[PDB]
Design a protein around this ligand. Structure first.
Ligand code: HEA
Ligand code: HEA
Ligand code: PEF
Ligand code: PEF
Ligand code: PEF
Ligand code: PEF
Ligand code: PEF
Ligand code: PEF
Ligand code: PEF
Ligand code: CA
Ligand code: MG
Ligand code: ZN
Lengths: 59, 121, 236, 269, 534, 51, 55, 102, 133
């Protein structure tokens, strides 16, 4: 509903990194950080099994 | 108080006066409505015809002796200058770095370049 | 026929293809050597003359005459060394009435030869696998990784069409002494023509990666006289 | 202006991007996706949920990256003329890369068809495969795609003319036309006589058609984000790069679909 | 520290990250080459207890590490990203986040390639990943898939860098530069970017279809279903021959700069240099099928392709002859970069001559998949890329780092690598012409002789590499001390033979490019006021 | 944004002000780079017979 | 007086070019006429002896 | 457009006449000697006059040193220096090989 | 202009000690010699001419060569030592390796040569494979 000027004022006067300037940045940045950490840590733990030759049990 | 919207290029005072008012209720925004910052400044320069972000090439009309060196304007205390001769491409490109204290001489065509800064950082 | 230690040239030819490609290689190397000598001498003299030059001729940039000369000199060299290339390519490509046709199917780390044109008892096709002799099973005198369990016996002075194909991966039928190197894709056949001019033995290997046993899969072609070839075929 | 004021700006049109985590984050997500799909297609991972999580992370990282780029373009005003020209040129290069990918797929089709394998029956399509009739569904697909291209051109001209309602209506209806094309192509996938695993014919056919399907999904996403931006007054009458981007994408993808239609339907049947 | 490097946005930081990754991967590839050349020194399983699969895995790792992780991150990534904005006066490369993501998807391709080597058996298909050896029947396990994903990641990096370079050099040129006034290295990078742009999509399509055949039961190259591996050969080589020209063209750009600056006279026919590089790039796409003369193509196809491959010798010959013309009539300052450039000229001419001998569809019958081919492409690749990288480093590092390297050690390293590489790669020609097949861990014991002396050569080359690693250390801790004492070369251009020492001291830098006018390590964002040129 | 500039400010690693000597890190980087293939060979030989 | 002396570098260039062509020609002539012709002579002699012993 | 010898000589006589300081004299001498020809004795005369005008002895010696390093034979150098003997004696410039006798 | 002449204690043997002087003394000497240049050049003494020539075109600072009079021998010794160390390491790692093939004997290869002589292999070339002892 035509918030461009208000958000321009908010964005051009802010001592924060660009992705944190919007008031609803935390809602998109905290769950993303958690999910990203999980999704990056998980596959690496399965590499020692690949080297060891152990496949995942079909249970 | 409140700052204006820099109606033309002569009222621009800082990046905070380059915002302007948006579209009213239901019309498409125009360039003069919601452009901001550097793009807004460039747009203003286009409307009043003053081409911001000067792109003119080097002054290569005369030789530029030591008594009357070719003056180059800068916004920093040095500037790089690639000269090619008294005509446009007489000799090969020669890159020089004239600063405030020391003029730059080509050593191939002898041109002397003297820097003057805008300054006020 | 067989590789020699500290050798720097081709193996001895036994087919017109190998001697033709040898002559083509020498003819090409003639011009390659004149060019290499030119480049090396120019580099030599320029470096040793102008490494002690105080004044650099910094105003010599375009020089159109030498530009066009070395623009048109490589072209004429290429045409000169490409005429015999085309002659040989169109001469060795022809299939001119092979008096014998035999198949060589490359299976995983072995070959299988099949003399489809000839008989064993009455009409039935002759075939045999050619396994490499293991290093533990070598008797003193045989060549390691080069002598097979059974040899591919071939008559001399006869036109022979080798039809090479494969079953699992791409296996290359390559004998350098006979001057033949044609691959074997499992999908399609590949025919090559050969005429062996002297009796003896000819060793080659597979010129295409096929897994762990790529190194230990050679090809042994033993060219013998025609009556002896018939005797071997009947004993086969 | 005076020197006092001109000393307070960039001195060059080009955009200084602030440091951002999105490149390395997208790289980590892409690595995790590749690793998970390599350990899942070979049974080292019991289920396919990890690939889904990696794809979701990659998608969200790309969304945050585009959220930053639209913040810079719209609310910081960093996109001057030179930046806009550079972005348009880069998107043209990316479109050229996609066209060459499609050309490689077309090369695979032509190699599989012009020299038919003896195991295929020496005829295209191979014996045992009944090809999809071009006239029933694909004719509707191509006609609605040409309609979508004409409609997005109409909406773009209406946006330039300054009429908001016509531009929004055209963009919405072309988004719906593309989402109907996607639905119809999925339907054609469901009731199909042959599968991607039924020889080279099915292999190359579904490779090309599914690559175009993925490109159409991406194009529908771009049209949706352009509709949001135009609805909330992000797109001005004279400054819009993403919308010109999606128009060029729509037209090049319609041309790709026309070639794909002709080759795979009016020449392959 | 995290924002500057992990969150990087400027081209110089990404370039030095590229260089660090490239030298790490080159060290790993050199270790693999040392292992290969040590096992392949005498007949019989010496160091690897049998296990030809391990030897094939090492060959694949060596080739990939050298090509996709050493030559390209250094030439295209490091030098290209550091110098292209500087040479054209661009303040900072366009699409900076794309520039960061290309680098950051490189080492993850490394991670997945390494874990492919570590998983059940490793990829033993060669750097070319030909089916059906690479199909799911012959290679099971996720190793081939992980190598495919490493190739996809490096293709993404290269394509993104190519788009960035194209846009930067087309749009962000300084106010005085037309396209005709660009430096030669900029032109080489631009042409290489277009080659990557037009080549990588085909490789991606072919490799993705191979992966689908492996794991999605589909048949693009399966003979049981109507496929043909020759299609994969076509796609891969259509990518790969432009790939080798991508590897070599930036070397051409670097050598021109080094010759022009250490002969103190400009390049002979610069516009002809640009035209020759453009012709080479255009012709690289028309000759791809000379790697597959054996598969059974028609006589007319091979006759066309040998002519097309021979045509490339004309622009390359023009470039070689113009470099000698540039060196002629100058004042040769025989510093380390000039030594490397001269060695490049000679050994690249040798490699190109061997390639011309290989371009014939009749001679390729006797030479295909032998060690003559490895001699040829190791000459051209190793020399024209590694020597170009050494020249570029020894030429630009005192400007990039503000730290000056030892010169005696640099010359010793150059001589050691020159002799070692010659010793390792020249007997390969004799082995190939005698009939030694390629990609074999064990050979008939008649090929041992040369395989011995070549194995000696590696132990020299790697040693020079080790010295290079020491030189970096000596540069990184004693660079300022090297400047203050007389152990290094401070000025790349000596005063002219009329010019006094003070007149030179007031005009110490006489260069044709902006890069050398910049200070000790250049500011994080230079060119505040745009560089002007007539 | 303003980052520090200087002779050692252009590189990700720290050279002058160090707790451990810089030679250790400099040569360890390339030593692990060189030992990656040895680790791979050791693993691939363990999964067969030997060491 | 001094006669105008000029064009020394062009003369040096053509002298170097012809001398390099002569060196390459000598190298390739040695290659051909010694090595290739020795191999051809050996092959022809062996085949002539084989044809003689066939009689 | 390629210049003749007479045009070259006149151009460099002029360019030496409008040389105003040591930097200009050295630059003009450098780009005069960076050609595929040895400058005529009149150009060397103008170079010596310019070196005396800016009060720089070593560049006057360097003129003869560059002429020696530029000329083809050891006899044409003698023909240059004995033709320029009067001016060299007038200005008092010594040759490099006679200034450092070794 | 200036006084009679430059002091001999400050101008003799400028070649052997120019680089060891402080910059202030160098600048003072340069200024004095430049003030003396303005006199007719016949009045300058020979040490003054030599000093001025060495200051202008001396082989120091900018004119310092790439190799400083002893580096060719150093690089030759370094490359020879590198070659020797390379072959020494190669020999050491060749000793710390597996065993040599069973077919690399004089006796085995003489029998192989006899078999090849039976088959008339490589008639004009060479079929002899010994290469070992
Ligand atoms: C970039 C390409 C590149 C380079 C430089 C090399 C260099 C070397 N290679 Fe190889 N090689 C290949 C790419 C390369 N190779 C490819 C593509 C194959 C084909 C694989 C196949 O067919 O399956 C191959 C195959 C191959 C074979 C044939 C194996 C076979 O077919 O059986 C051999 C055998 O000796 C070998 C060993 C070596 C050795 C000892 C070096 C030595 O030269 C090592 C010495 C090199 C250096 C010391 C480089 C310097 C190191 C740096 C890190 C650069 C530093 C500079 C900067 C950082 C600016 N490699
Ligand atoms: C650095 C990258 C690089 C470069 C620049 C080249 C350059 C050339 N290459 Fe090569 N090549 C490879 C990398 C490269 N190559 C690789 C990696 C392989 C193996 C792939 C694999 O099997 O895995 C390969 C294999 C390869 C083959 C396949 C053979 C086979 O395996 O069956 C062929 C055949 O045509 C070939 C030829 C050429 C030719 C004619 C050139 C020409 O561009 C060279 C031209 C230069 C000159 C000719 C010298 C300079 C010119 C003059 C001095 C003028 C005078 C010359 C004449 C008149 C002729 N090379
Ligand atoms: C530099 C070019 C020099 C070429 C050969 C010099 C080596 C001397 C030698 O090796 O020649 C000695 C050898 C002796 O070995 P033999 O084969 O007689 O062994 C007999 C069996 N037991 O004779 C030759 O075969 C001649 C040389 C063969 C050359 C062909 C192989 C190509 C090598 C170079 C590749 C191309 C490089 C670029 C040139 C265009
Ligand atoms: C195919 C023949 C050789 C191809 C290339 C060989 C190697 C290339 C490297 C050359 C190094 C120097 C080049 C730069 C010099 C330069 O720029 O010189 C240019 C200058 C000035 O220009 P201008 O007066 O010509 O024109 C005026 C405007 N440009 O004059 C020259 O010097 C010309 C020299 C001509 C040489 C012709 C060739 C001589 C003999 C060829 C045939 C010999 C075969 C005989 C068999 C035994
Ligand atoms: C068959 C094919 C199916 C696919 C079709 C899918 C359709 C795609 C529709 C996506 C458009 C809606 C997104 C924004 C909605 C919204 O409201 O987010 C914007 C909201 C409120 O708006 P605002 O006015 O404040 O703008 C302010 C915009 N900065 O701001 C925010 O919190 C800021 C950040 C929001 C997070 C997402 C928006 C950032 C833009 C990047 C989006 C790129 C996605 C493209 C790929 C999916
Ligand atoms: C990196 C860039 C790579 C670019 C080149 C990509 C070449 C491959 C195109 C992929 C299209 C596959 C498809 O869309 O497959 C469509 C088929 C259609 O099913 P069906 O008709 O057989 O149903 C039977 C009744 N008709 O789905 C499948 O069966 C499963 C396909 C395999 C699983 C999905 C693989 C997706 C890979 C996407 C790669 C994207 C990148
Ligand atoms: C993956 C999903 C694909 C969906 C793409 C959504 C695009 C949102 C970006 C946006 O909207 O960015 C808006 C910006 C600038 O907008 P503007 O100047 O018009 O702003 C006007 C306000 N005054 O456009 C661009 O820089 C173009 C970039 C296009 C990106 C192409 C898609 C990338 C595909 C790679 C995979
Ligand atoms: C996939 C490959 C996508 C290529 C996009 C090129 C479009 C032109 C362009 O360059 O788009 C520019 C944008 C970013 O630009 P920036 O923020 O660096 O520029 C700031 C000033 N314009 O690219 C992207 O959004 C890349 C998005 C990556 C999404 C994940 C892809 C992983 C696979
Ligand atoms: C660079 C190219 C070569 C690298 C170094 C050469 C070492 C030579 C060596 O080590 O010896 C080379 C061998 C040693 O012969 P031999 O009698 O020891 O053979 C022992 C078993 N019969 O000579 C030959 O077989 C012929 C040599 C001709 C070709 C030489 C051309 C290059 C030299
Ligand atoms: Ca071995
Ligand atoms: Mg092959
Ligand atoms: Zn100039």
């Amino acid at each position: 509903a035509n918030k461009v000027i208000q958000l321009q004022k908010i964005f051009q006067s802010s001592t924060k990194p660009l992705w944190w300037r919007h008031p609803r940045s935390a809602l998109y940045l905290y769950p993303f950080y958690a999910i990203f950490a999980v999704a990056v840590v998980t596959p690496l733990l399965y590499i020692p099994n690949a080297i060891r030759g152990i496949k995942a049990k079909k249970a | 108080p409140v700052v204006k919207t820099a109606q033309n290029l002569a009222e621009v005072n800082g990046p905070e006066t380059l915002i302007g008012p948006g579209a009213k209720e239901g019309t498409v925004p125009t360039d003069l409505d919601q452009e901001t910052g550097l793009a807004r400044l460039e747009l203003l320069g286009k409307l009043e015809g003053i081409d911001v972000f000067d792109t003119k090439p080097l002054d290569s009309s005369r030789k530029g002796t030591m008594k009357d060196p070719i003056i180059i304007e800068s916004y920093d205390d040095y500037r790089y200058v690639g000269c090619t001769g008294s005509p446009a491409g007489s000799h090969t490109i020669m890159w020089l770095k004239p600063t405030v204290n020391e003029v730059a001489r080509c050593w191939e065509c002898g041109s002397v370049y003297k820097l003057n800064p805008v300054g006020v950082p | 026929d067989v590789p020699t230690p500290y050798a720097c040239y081709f193996q001895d030819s036994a087919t017109p293809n190998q001697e033709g490609i040898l002559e083509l290689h020498d003819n090409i190397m003639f011009y390659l050597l004149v060019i290499l000598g030119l480049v090396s001498w120019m580099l030599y003299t320029i470096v040793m003359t102008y490494s002690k030059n105080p004044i650099a001729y910094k105003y010599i940039k375009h020089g159109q005459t030498i530009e066009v000369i070395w623009t048109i000199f490589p072209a004429v060299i290429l045409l000169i060394i490409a005429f015999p290339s085309f002659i040989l390519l169109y001469l060795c490509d022809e299939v001119i009435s092979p008096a014998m046709t035999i198949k060589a199917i490359g299976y995983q780390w072995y070959w299988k030869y099949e003399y489809s044109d000839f008989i064993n008892d009455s009409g039935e096709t002759v075939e045999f696998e050619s396994y490499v002799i293991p290093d533990e099973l070598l008797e003193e005198g045989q060549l390691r990784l080069l002598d097979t369990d059974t040899s591919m016996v071939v008559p001399v002075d006869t036109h022979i069409r080798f039809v090479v194909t494969a079953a699992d991966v791409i296996h290359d039928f390559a004998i350098p002494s006979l001057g033949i190197k044609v691959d074997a894709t499992p999908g399609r056949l590949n025919q090559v023509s050969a005429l062996i001019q002297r009796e003896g033995v000819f060793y080659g290997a597979c010129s295409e990666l096929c897994g762990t046993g790529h190194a230990n899969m050679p090809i042994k072609i033993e060219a013998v006289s025609l009556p002896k070839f018939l005797e071997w075929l009947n004993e086969q | 202006m005076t020197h006092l004021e001109r000393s307070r700006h960039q001195q060059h049109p080009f955009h200084m991007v602030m440091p951002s985590p999105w490149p390395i984050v997208v790289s980590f997500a892409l690595l995790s996706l590749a690793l998970s799909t390599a350990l899942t297609m070979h049974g080292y991972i019991g289920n396919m949920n990890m690939v889904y999580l990696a794809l979701f992370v990659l998608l969200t990282s790309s969304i945050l990256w585009f959220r930053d780029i639209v913040a810079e373009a719209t609310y910081l005003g960093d996109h001057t003329m030179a930046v806009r020209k550079g972005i348009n040129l880069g998107f043209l290069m990316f479109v050229l890369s996609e066209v060459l990918i499609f050309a490689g797929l077309f090369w695979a089709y032509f190699h599989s068809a012009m020299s038919p394998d003896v195991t295929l029956g020496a005829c295209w399509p191979p014996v045992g495969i009944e090809a999809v009739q071009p006239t029933e569904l694909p004719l509707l697909n191509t006609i609605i795609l040409l309609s979508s291209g004409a409609t997005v051109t109409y909406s773009h001209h209406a946006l330039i003319a300054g009429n908001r309602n016509k531009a929004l209506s055209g963009l919405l209806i072309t988004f719906w036309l593309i989402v109907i094309f996607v639905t119809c192509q999925y339907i054609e996938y469901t009731n199909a006589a042959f599968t991607i695993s039924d020889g080279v014919y099915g292999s190359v056919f579904y490779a090309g058609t599914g690559l175009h399907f993925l490109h159409m999904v991406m194009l529908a996403a771009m049209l949706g984000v352009n509709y949001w931006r135009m609805r909330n007054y992000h797109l001005t009458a004279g400054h819009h790069v993403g919308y010109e981007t999606t128009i060029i994408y729509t037209h090049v993808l319609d041309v790709i679909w026309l070639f794909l239609y002709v080759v795979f339907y009016w020449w392959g049947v | 520290m995290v924002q500057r490097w992990l969150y990087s946005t400027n081209a110089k930081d990404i370039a030095v990250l590229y260089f660090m990754l490239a030298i790490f991967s080159g060290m790993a590839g050199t270790a693999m080459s040392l292992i290969i050349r040590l096992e392949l020194a005498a007949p019989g399983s010496q160091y690897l207890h049998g296990n030809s699969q391990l030897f094939n895995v090492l060959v694949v790792g060596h080739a990939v590490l050298m090509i996709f992780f050493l030559v390209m991150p250094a030439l295209i990534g490091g030098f290209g990203n550091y110098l292209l904005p500087l040479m054209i006066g661009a303040t900072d490369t366009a699409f900076p986040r794309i520039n960061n993501i290309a680098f950051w998807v490189l080492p993850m391709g490394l991670v997945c390639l390494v874990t492919s080597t570590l998983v059940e058996s490793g990829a033993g298909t060669g750097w070319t990943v030909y089916p059906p050896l690479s199909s799911i029947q012959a290679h099971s396990g996720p190793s081939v898939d992980l190598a495919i994903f490493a190739l996809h990641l490096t293709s993404i990096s290269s394509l993104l860098g190519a788009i960035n370079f194209i846009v930067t050099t087309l749009n962000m040129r300084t106010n005085g530069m037309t396209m005709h006034k660009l430096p030669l290295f900029v032109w080489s990078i631009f042409i290489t970017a277009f080659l990557l742009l037009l080549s990588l999509p085909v490789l991606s399509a072919g490799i993705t279809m191979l992966l689908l055949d492996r794991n999605f039961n589909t048949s693009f190259f399966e003979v049981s279903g109507g496929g043909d591996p020759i299609l994969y050969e076509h796609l891969f080589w259509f990518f790969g021959h432009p790939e080798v020209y991508i590897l070599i063209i930036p070397g051409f750009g670097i050598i021109s700069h080094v010759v022009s600056t250490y002969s103190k006279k400009p390049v002979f026919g610069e516009i002809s240099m640009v035209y020759a590089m453009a012709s080479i790039g255009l012709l690289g796409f028309l000759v791809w099928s000379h790697h597959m003369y054996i598969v059974g193509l028609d006589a007319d196809t091979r006759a066309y392709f040998t002519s097309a491959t021979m045509i490339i010798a004309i622009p390359t010959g023009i470039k070689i002859f113009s470099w000698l013309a540039t060196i002629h009539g100058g004042s040769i300052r025989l510093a380390t970069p000039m030594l490397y450039a001269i060695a490049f000229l000679f050994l690249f001419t040798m490699g190109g001559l061997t390639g011309v001998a290989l371009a014939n569809a009749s001679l390729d019958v006797a030479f295909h998949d032998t060690y003559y081919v490895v001699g040829h492409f190791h000459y051209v690749l190793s020399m024209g890329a590694i020597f170009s990288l050494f020249a570029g480093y020894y030429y630009w590092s005192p400007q990039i780092l503000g730290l000056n390297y030892n010169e005696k050690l640099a010359q010793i390293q150059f001589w050691l690598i020159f002799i070692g590489a010659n010793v390792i790669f020249f007997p390969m020609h004799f082995l190939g012409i005698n009939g030694m097949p390629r990609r074999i861990p064990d050979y008939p014991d008649a090929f041992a002789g040369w395989n011995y002396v070549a194995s000696i050569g590696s132990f020299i080359a790697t040693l020079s590499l080790f010295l290079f690693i020491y030189i970096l250390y000596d540069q990184l801790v004693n660079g300022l001390n090297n400047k203050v004492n007389n152990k290094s070369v401070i000025y790349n251009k000596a005063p002219d033979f009329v010019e006094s020492n003070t007149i030179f001291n007031l005009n110490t830098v006489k260069s044709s490019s902006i890069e050398f006018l910049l200070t000790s390590p250049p500011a994080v964002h230079s060119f505040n006021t745009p560089a002007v040129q007539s | 944004v303003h980052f520090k500039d200087g002779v050692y400010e252009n590189i990700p690693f720290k050279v002058k002000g160090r707790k451990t000597p810089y030679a250790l890190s400099h040569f360890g980087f390339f030593a692990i780079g060189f030992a990656v293939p040895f680790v791979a060979c050791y693993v691939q030989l363990k999964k067969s017979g030997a060491f | 007086t001094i006669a105008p002396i000029t064009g020394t570098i062009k003369r040096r260039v053509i002298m170097d070019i012809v001398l390099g062509f002569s060196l390459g020609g000598v190298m390739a002539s040695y290659w051909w006429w010694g090595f290739h012709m020795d191999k051809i002579n050996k092959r022809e002699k062996f085949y002539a002896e084989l044809a003689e012993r066939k009689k | 457009d390629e210049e003749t010898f007479e045009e070259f000589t006149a151009r460099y006589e002029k360019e030496f006449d409008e040389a105003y300081d040591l930097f200009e004299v050295q630059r003009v001498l450098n780009n005069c000697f960076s050609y595929d020809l040895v400058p005529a004795p009149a150009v060397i005369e103008k170079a010596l006059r310019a070196a005396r005008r800016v009060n720089d002895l070593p560049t006057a010696i360097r003129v003869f040193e560059a002429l020696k390093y530029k000329v083809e034979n050891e006899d044409q150098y003698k023909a240059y220096l004995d033709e320029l003997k009067d001016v060299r004696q007038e200005l008092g410039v010594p040759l490099k090989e006679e200034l450092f006798p070794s | 202009a200036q006084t009679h002449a430059l002091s001999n204690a400050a101008v003799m043997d400028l070649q052997s000690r120019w680089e060891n002087m402080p910059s202030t003394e160098q600048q003072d000497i340069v200024s004095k010699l430049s003030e003396r240049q303005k006199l007719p050049w016949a009045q300058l003494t020979e040490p003054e001419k030599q000093a001025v020539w060495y200051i202008s075109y001396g082989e120091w600072g900018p004119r310092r060569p790439v190799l400083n009079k002893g580096d060719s021998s150093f690089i030759a010794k370094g490359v020879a030592a590198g070659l020797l160390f390379s072959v020494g390491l190669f020999a050491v790692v060749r000793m710390a390796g597996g065993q040599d093939a069973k077919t690399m004997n004089k006796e085995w290869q003489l029998k192989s040569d006899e078999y090849l002589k039976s088959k008339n292999a490589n008639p004009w070339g060479g079929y002899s494979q010994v290469q070992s002892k």
